[PDB]
Amino acid sequence: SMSYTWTGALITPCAAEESKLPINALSNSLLRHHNMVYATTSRSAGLRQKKVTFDRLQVLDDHYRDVLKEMKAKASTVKAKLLSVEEACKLTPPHSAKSKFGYGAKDVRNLSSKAVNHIHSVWKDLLEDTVTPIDTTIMAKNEVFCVQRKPARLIVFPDLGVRVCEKMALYDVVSTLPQVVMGSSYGFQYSPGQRVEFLVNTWKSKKNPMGFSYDTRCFDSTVTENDIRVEESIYQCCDLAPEARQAIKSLTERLYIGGPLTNSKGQNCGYRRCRASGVLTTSCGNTLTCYLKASAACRAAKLQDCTMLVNGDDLVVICESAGTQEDAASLRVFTEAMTRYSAPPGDPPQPEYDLELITSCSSNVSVAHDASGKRVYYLTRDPTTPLARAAWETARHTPVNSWLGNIIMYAPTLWARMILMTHFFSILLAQEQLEKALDCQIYGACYSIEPLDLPQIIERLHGLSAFSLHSYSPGEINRVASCLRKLGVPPLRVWRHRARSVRARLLSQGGRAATCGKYLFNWAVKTKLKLTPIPAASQLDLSGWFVAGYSGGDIYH
Ligand SMILES: CC(C)[C@H]1C(O)=C(C2=NS(=O)(=O)c3ccccc32)C(=O)N1Cc1ccccc1
Numbered sequence: 356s357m358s359y360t361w362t363g364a365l366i367t368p369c370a371a372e373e374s375k376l377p378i379n380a381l382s383n384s385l386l387r388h389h390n391m392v393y394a395t396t397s398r399s400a401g402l403r404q405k406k407v408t409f410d411r412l413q414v415l416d417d418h419y420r421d422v423l424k425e426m427k428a429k430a431s432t433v434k435a436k437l438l439s440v441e442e443a444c445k446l447t448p449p450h451s452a453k454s455k456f457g458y459g460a461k462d463v464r465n466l467s468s469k470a471v472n473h474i475h476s477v478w479k480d481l482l483e484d485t486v487t488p489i490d491t492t493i494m495a496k497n498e499v500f501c502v503q504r505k506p507a508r509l510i511v512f513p514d515l516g517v518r519v520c521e522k523m524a525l526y527d528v529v530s531t532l533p534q535v536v537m538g539s540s541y542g543f544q545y546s547p548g549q550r551v552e553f554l555v556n557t558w559k560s561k562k563n564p565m566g567f568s569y570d571t572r573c574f575d576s577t578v579t580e581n582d583i584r585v586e587e588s589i590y591q592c593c594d595l596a597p598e599a600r601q602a603i604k605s606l607t608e609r610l611y612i613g614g615p616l617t618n619s620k621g622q623n624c625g626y627r628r629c630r631a632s633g634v635l636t637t638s639c640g641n642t643l644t645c646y647l648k649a650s651a652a653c654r655a656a657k658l659q660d661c662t663m664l665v666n667g668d669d670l671v672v673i674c675e676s677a678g679t680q681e682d683a684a685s686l687r688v689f690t691e692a693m694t695r696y697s698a699p700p701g702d703p704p705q706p707e708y709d710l711e712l713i714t715s716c717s718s719n720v721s722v723a724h725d726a727s728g729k730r731v732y733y734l735t736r737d738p739t740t741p742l743a744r745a746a747w748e749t750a751r752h753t754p755v756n757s758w759l760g761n762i763i764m765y766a767p768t769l770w771a772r773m774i775l776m777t778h779f780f781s782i783l784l785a786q787e788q789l790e791k792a793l794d795c796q797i798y799g800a801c802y803s804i805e806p807l808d809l810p811q812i813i814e815r816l817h818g819l820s821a822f823s824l825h826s827y828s829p830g831e832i833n834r835v836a837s838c839l840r841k842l843g844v845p846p847l848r849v850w851r852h853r854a855r856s857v858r859a860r861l862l863s864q865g866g867r868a869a870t871c872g873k874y875l876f877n878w879a880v881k882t883k884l885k886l887t888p889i890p891a892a893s894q895l896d897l898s899g900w901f902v903a904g905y906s907g908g909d910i911y912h
Pocket of ligand 1: 797
């Protein structure tokens with residue numbers, strides 16, 4: 356069937372939208388070529404609508420149903436609880452979309468009478484009605500990129516009251532079941548340091564390793580009613596409370612398999628018969644369905660010793676090579692199986708033979724050397740987009756600061772350290788907002804971080820290595836230098852002078868600020884410190900961090 360049907364009505368913005376890079380006094384110090392940077396807006400939503408709209412066909416063979424059986428047995432060992440209205444309420448981001456029924460996220464966060472009353476009524480309605488499609492809002496995502504100029508991505512989400520209800524019914528399921536179903540292949544359990552460790556160990560565990568990523572053409576749109584009904588029969592495998600089973604059935608019939616689409620004005624835009632991007636189960640479903648299709652497609656293409664690594668739609672496979680030309684041939688069969696399963700590719704998969712040449716979760720493995728000369732494997736990426744987004748957030752305050760999320764996840768990298776750390780810690784010194792908590796997104800969940808806890812966080816997710824890394828790979832050094840050339844970013848020399856200034860200004864503050872300069876910027880000095888393990892790092896409660904993915908799922912910690 357068609358993934359979408361369209362009435363003709365436009366996808367409208369909520370507030371004001373800027374497509375070109377905003378400029379302040381601090382912009383040029385980071386980036387010179389400003390017309391290379393742009394953000395997607397609801398202006399381009401019509402191109403995306405075309406790209407997401409297509410007929411899906413599905414052919415389900417025995418390999419599909421074999422893998423599904425296996426998944427179901429594992430899923431049936433799961434016991435999940437109903438979350439109380441209040442517990443579910445506290446998982447709402449403070450900046451999450453307001454209800455059409457006269458309340459907002461903070462009303463939900465403080466547990467106001469109006470909101471909780473309404474949520475209980477939506478829950479009741481979920482139990483007593485398993486048929487009526489639930490209204491969703493269709494919105495274009497505003498996201499910053501550097502030119503090659505992409506269209507806006509879409510977001511489809513239900514009302515805040517329904518979102519809290521999904522939480523009551525399914526928060527426990529989406530958090531625990533995926534790791535139980537897919538084990539080592541569930542990506543969202545790993546921190547950066549564990550992701551590199553798992554990748555490298557897998558690679559070397561093969562006699563002759565072959566790795567590939569699979570770019571699916573718009574995953575969400577390819578998800579069918581079959582896939583959504585199938586993933587529900589997976590959730591139902593869990594030992595659930597009778598109310599949960601009804602709510603999961605109900606949310607599946609009425610909301611997950613599809614429903615009517617409404618712009619931010621309140622106008623009917625059409626109908627969805629594919630994955631909604633902004634529901635609680637978006638990350639988990641995508642991870643389940645992708646694992647399913649891909650698992651079976653490996654069997655169809657007779658790939659041997661497959662270790663898959665799934666994070667939603669994003670998939671990477673490491674296997675035993677059959678030889679370059681047979682690896683190529685096997686991937687053509689894998690693609691054929693995936694296409695048959697309604698997961699056709701965008702750019703076709705290619706077989707790779709250097710771990711560093713494989714991009715998974717927008718990242719590649721790479722090698723650097725710590726203080727003692729030890730080979731340290733770390734994850735990195737082309738820094739273009741993070742730096743473009745950092746240029747936008749230099750001039751426009753955003754609910755989720757993507758630079759901080761980057762500094763957290765890419766802390767051991769050359770570009771995060773010498774540019775991202777230096778620039779924003781300078782920004783925060785100038786504003787005196789170092790003790791001010793900032794929000795970022797890790798695995799889809801929104802986290803509230805205080806900048807001064809960064810060395811403690813970095814030690815915990817990467818090890819003390821992340822502060823000592825030098826002698827980066829020439830390929831990595833080039834790629835960074837190539838990106839900085841393109842963007843018009845100052846050279847390494849400039850950033851060293853700024854970091855020396857940042858560090859010295861942090862040292863004067865004493866305490867957590869001094870600890871910041873010491874650890875984050877020891878790279879910028881000639882007479883470097885030997886960095887000790889920070890004692891106040893075992894203190895940190897990093898629970899919720901690497902448990903599951905929640906992209907579009909409207910989750911807060
Ligand atoms: C952007 C940063 C914060 C982080 C992330 O949240 C994601 C990430 N967030 S997400 O839940 O939207 C998602 C879905 C699928 C695949 C990845 C992701 C990611 O890829 N990251 C990059 C990354 C770096 C090192 C190790 C693993 C991932």
